[PDB]
């Protein structure tokens, strides 16, 4: 299974974060596997699977030409890489807040987020 779908929850989804800091990105970016090379940008969105899955129906606008945005906020943690170096160990520094938040959907289901929203 290397469906889009699997992926986008692997990189995108903690329903309960155990904090919302820097020290929480580095922790989590390891633990999905995104340090190899350290990925530059990544967001987590917190609370429940259904609600992101709504955003691809009536909770969701279409967004110029192929995305979509939510109708409500979401708590969501942003980790961003610093130091400039693609090799481990990561750094990251953390941006948590309540956002809207802009995806790319397929058959029904989110497949990408949009990092430059933000």
């Not at 633990?31 to 129906?57: E, Q, W």
């Amino acid at each position: 299974d290397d469906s889009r779908y699997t992926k986008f929850l692997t990189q995108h989804h903690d329903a309960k974060p155990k904090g919302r800091d820097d020290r929480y990105c580095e922790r989590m970016m390891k633990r999905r596997s995104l340090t190899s090379p350290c990925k530059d940008v990544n967001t987590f969105i917190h609370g429940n699977k259904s609600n992101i899955k709504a955003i691809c129906g009536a909770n969701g606008s279409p967004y110029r030409e192929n995305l979509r945005m939510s109708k409500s906020p979401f708590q969501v943690t942003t980790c961003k890489h610093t130091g400039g170096s693609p090799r481990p160990p990561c750094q990251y520094r953390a941006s948590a807040g309540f956002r809207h938040v802009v995806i790319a959907c397929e058959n029904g289901l989110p497949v990408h987020f949009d990092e430059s929203f933000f």
